[PDB]
Swiss-Prot record, chain A:
The modification Phosphoserine is found at S276. This is DNA-dependent protein kinase catalytic subunit. Autophosphorylated at two clusters, the T2609 cluster and the S2056 cluster. Autophosphorylation induces a conformational change that leads to remodeling of the DNA-PK complex, requisite for efficient end processing and DNA repair. S-nitrosylated by GAPDH. The gene is PRKDC. Belongs to the PI3/PI4-kinase family. The chain holds residues 2295 to 2899 of 4128 of the full protein. Changing S297N: In a metastatic melanoma sample; somatic mutation. It comes from Homo sapiens (Human). Serine/threonine-protein kinase that acts as a molecular sensor for DNA damage. Involved in DNA non-homologous end joining (NHEJ) required for double-strand break (DSB) repair and V(D)J recombination. Must be bound to DNA to express its catalytic properties. Promotes processing of hairpin DNA structures in V(D)J recombination by activation of the hairpin endonuclease artemis (DCLRE1C). Recruited by XRCC5 and XRCC6 to DNA ends and is required to (1) protect and align broken ends of DNA, thereby preventing their degradation, (2) and sequester the DSB for repair by NHEJ. DNA-PK is a heterotrimer of PRKDC and the Ku dimer (composed of XRCC6/Ku70 and XRCC5/Ku86). Formation of this complex may be promoted by interaction with ILF3. Component of the core long-range non-homologous end joining (NHEJ) complex (also named DNA-PK complex) composed of PRKDC, LIG4, XRCC4, XRCC6/Ku70, XRCC5/Ku86 and NHEJ1/XLF. Additional component of the NHEJ complex includes PAXX. Following autophosphorylation, PRKDC dissociates from DNA. Interacts with DNA-PKcs-interacting protein (KIP) with the region upstream the kinase domain.
Swiss-Prot record, chain B:
Residues 217-424 form the Ku domain. This is X-ray repair cross-complementing protein 6. Changing K1A: Diminishes the ability to form a Schiff base. Abolishes adduct formation. The gene is XRCC6. Individuals with systemic lupus erythematosus (SLE) and related disorders produce extremely large amounts of autoantibodies to XRCC5 and XRCC6. Existence of a major autoantigenic epitope or epitopes on the C-terminal 190 amino acids of XRCC6 containing the leucine repeat. The majority of autoantibodies to XRCC6 in most sera from patients with SLE seem to be reactive with this region. It is found in: Nucleus; Chromosome; Cytoplasm. The chain holds residues 31 to 534 of 609 of the full protein. Coiled coil: none annotated. Its EC number is 3.6.4.-, 4.2.99.-. Single-stranded DNA-dependent ATP-dependent helicase that plays a key role in DNA non-homologous end joining (NHEJ) by recruiting DNA-PK to DNA. Required for double-strand break repair and V(D)J recombination. Also has a role in chromosome translocation. Has a role in chromosome translocation. The DNA helicase II complex binds preferentially to fork-like ends of double-stranded DNA in a cell cycle-dependent manner. It works in the 3'-5' direction. Belongs to the ku70 family. The modification Phosphothreonine is found at T411. The modification Phosphoserine is found at S21, S262, S433, S476.
Amino acid sequence: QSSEYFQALVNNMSFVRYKEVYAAAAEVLGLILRYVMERKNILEESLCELVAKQLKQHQNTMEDKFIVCLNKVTKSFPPLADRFMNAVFFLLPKFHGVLKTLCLEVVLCRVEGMTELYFQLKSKDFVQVMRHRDDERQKVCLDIIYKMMPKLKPVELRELLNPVVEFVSHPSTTCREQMYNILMWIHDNYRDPESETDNDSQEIFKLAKDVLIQGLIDENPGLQLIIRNFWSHETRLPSNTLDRLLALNSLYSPKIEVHFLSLATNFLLEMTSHSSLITPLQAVAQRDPIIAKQLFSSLFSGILKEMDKFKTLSEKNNITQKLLQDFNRFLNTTFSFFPPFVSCIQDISCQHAALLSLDPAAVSAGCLASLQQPVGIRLLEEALLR
Amino acid sequence: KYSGRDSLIFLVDASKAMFESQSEDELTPFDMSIQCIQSVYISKIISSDRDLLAVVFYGTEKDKNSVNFKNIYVLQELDNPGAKRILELDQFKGQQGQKRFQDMMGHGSDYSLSEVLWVCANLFSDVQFKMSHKRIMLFTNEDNPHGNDSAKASRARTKAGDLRDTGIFLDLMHLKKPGGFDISLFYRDIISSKLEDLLRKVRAKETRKRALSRLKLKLNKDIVISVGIYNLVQKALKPPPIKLYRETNEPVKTKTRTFNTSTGGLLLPSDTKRSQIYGSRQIILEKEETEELKRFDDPGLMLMGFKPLVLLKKHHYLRPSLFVYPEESLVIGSSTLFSALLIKCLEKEVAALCRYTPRRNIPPYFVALVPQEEELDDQKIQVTPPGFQLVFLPFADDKRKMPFTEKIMATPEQVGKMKAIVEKLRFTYRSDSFENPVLQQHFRNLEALALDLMEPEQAVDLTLPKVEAMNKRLGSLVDEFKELVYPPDY
DNA sequence: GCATGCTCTACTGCTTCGATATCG
DNA sequence: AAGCAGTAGAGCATGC
């Protein structure tokens, strides 16, 4: 009958000397408990109580075997650490090695539904074990933070975000994949769109507009197709014809200038609707800088040549004064000047009597350090004429 | 476990009227609590000097805690009893200390709830060691501290239940707001007055437990049994006198050599031999030779007959007496053979006789194994454990010879007087408490240097006779017992 | 063909410290 | 004695 067989099994859990019997005993106990949980018609009220009484017998005599068996029962049974949740938090600054990974493996499961979490995790110095060179700890400790975002106030999220975005210089694409997975929500639901709210609710959006722009030069393609299809989404970069060209100035960020021209024509060239030669041009631009510079410098004046039909007389002045402002911003902002980009802006400005009066204090210190002096000399002389 | 350590957190309730004099000019409970805490530290700094002892005041005005709550001020952290900790802490004695605590932290606030027990749990969790005892000493006098808000009562009993789960237990040492124990209130929900243990009773003790030898008793040649030879009365004495440099205040780390062979130089273990002189002729030998001339047997116990408990007179003893117990590193069943041997040796009142060689090279020695059956009671008065006991036995030049040839008879006019005298002086023995004057005053004298209060402190010695209370208690029969039959008469 | 690479547990020793014999 | 820590060395899987 069903009163001694289970007792013999849970009693053989206590045979705690040899590795294979009690760990697999805990695992098969998790299987039995899960089958009788989802299959409710058979009772579980004896068995869950029996195995939990065994674990409460376990935890004070020896603790390593307690956390091992609780880890393996929770490997397929969530709700059986509620009775031990203060015990595992009591144990958490006591375990190193693989066992700290084991405790964190436990604590991931019973979060989504738990209140008042960040106090305990802040007490157990979480932001000093989110910054140690193991890999699996650092993957699991970020998968909890993808779960406990929508329970925090922005007073603490700006304390979490300061070492979680130290992970762009990390190896191991799953870890950085998590770190670009949390910022994708912190951008999409904190857009603070002129709402007059807070300085931290506008400051985390600044530091999350930093990393979704520095993450376009990652060393793992196949990942960056995700970030490109994020950034090339309708009403996320405005996709009419010309507004995308204007908005491409907004995501400049001088950590990516070495790739800026190829990225700009890529976002501009994706929205086609010719097939035989456009696709090798997209292919050939992002390999060599000079033909890419030529391609952006022709696309710019192509759209500005079409714009003189539409977009009436005041709007021409508005768009052109904004563009002049942006190019001034570029020359003042750049930190290590890229020559076939500095030449590209001072080559696309010189051919318009609306963008000429640029910044002669900026053109000079730009082209004495970019070593592209004869495009600047021609720009100032085309200015001093007319 | 053997290398296990215990832990204690002093949680002080200095909030509302405990900082007041209770409008009583008789005793102040803040200074009473700080005196009790000083007594605990000042005893366990030589009694049990490795446990963990922390001091935490709550209900204060400021705050100091690593989760950063309010009204809660931890003062020190879990560590040894230290002279710095007590010289820091005794600045809160008396009214001068009341004012100094007022200006240093202040007093009075709406004190906490569950959050102070949360601070205690985050104080215990940090320690990476093996905690064996988890106790909290609460010094409070109010007994309905949240008697206007039931949500805080329910959350406090919930958090105390979750502190009871992981293995933390509190014993609130009750201060005397009504003096007598008349607060028969409902504080049963949290707990698992008398202060004399914390006050006086332990000025010179220690705590330890080892086994001293693990030997094996062989009966014929092949029947072996394994016994641990415990020691139970050990003659504690004063610790070794560390050497110290004068100026830099550090140990000296001495070193030792041997030379000057009528040449100087420097020597080794091999160049020199051992020697003796006997009148006229000199012997020389090696160190292995003088260590091997006392070499008989192997370590263990050797069964050499049986005897009942009637020949041994307790005139005959030589050393203290050890205690042999059936350990568990030969077989599961040496306990059973010892239990059978115990039962038979006790019921036929027979005692074993053995030879006993203590360690790897010692001459053998005859012992006698006397059984002992345990005694416990209703309330677990575990006064004896069940097991066997060594008694040593002398050999030859132990027993000397007296002059001894004197035998004079007295007169029986004194026996009833002396029976009345010894019935006058009759007290039922003792169980404890006959402590050591020399070690005791050495403890107090060492207190009076690193604590340097005034002078050598109290030094009563409970081993002196009180002739002033003996004379009146006996009465005026001293003269009649002095000269009933016999005058000295000069 | 043996030449290499890789993995878990019993034999050796370490260190504290309490006791014990022994010297002075 | 009481406990920890290392590791030497014999036993699992694939190589000019």
